[PDB]
Specification:
This is part of a larger assembly, with three copies of chain A.
Chain A (H helix, E strand, L loop, with lengths): L3 H19 L12 H7 L2 H4 L2
PDB class: viral protein
Keywords: SARS-CoV-2, glycoprotein, fusion protein, viral protein
Entry title: Cryo-EM structure of the SARS-CoV-2 D614G mutant spike protein ectodomain
Chain lengths: ~50, ~50, ~50
Amino acid sequence: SALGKLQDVVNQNAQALNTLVKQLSSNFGAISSVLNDILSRLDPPEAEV
Amino acid sequence: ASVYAWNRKRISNCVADYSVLYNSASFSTFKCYGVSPTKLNDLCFTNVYA
Amino acid sequence: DSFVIRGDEVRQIAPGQTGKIADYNYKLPDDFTGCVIAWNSNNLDSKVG
């Protein structure tokens, strides 16, 4: 734990990237989190929503 | 069947042409909710129930 | 735009609708602005034969 300050900065940046990548898996109230599924399943009036 | 004892039929291991369902004018109501009617020929499904 | 349709087909003269005359006869855009006017014409546009 001598070099904890640099490892702390690296871990914080990597964790922020991992959270940002993980946020794509959430649908945020939509039917699916995948854009291709929505574009292949729905007409543009509801796919727009 | 009656609505209290509605009949559930499993559909599996088949290729389905839904285009004959949209283009037929015999149905007064043809309303889809989680999928577009015209995209049904482009997708693959399982657990299909009538 | 003037035309004659059925009584039950007046719901299909709207943006974003799935229907028969909507797809193959008269289509409205999703961003349509304006008004649809419909009135019964059984007295004029019908014949006994």
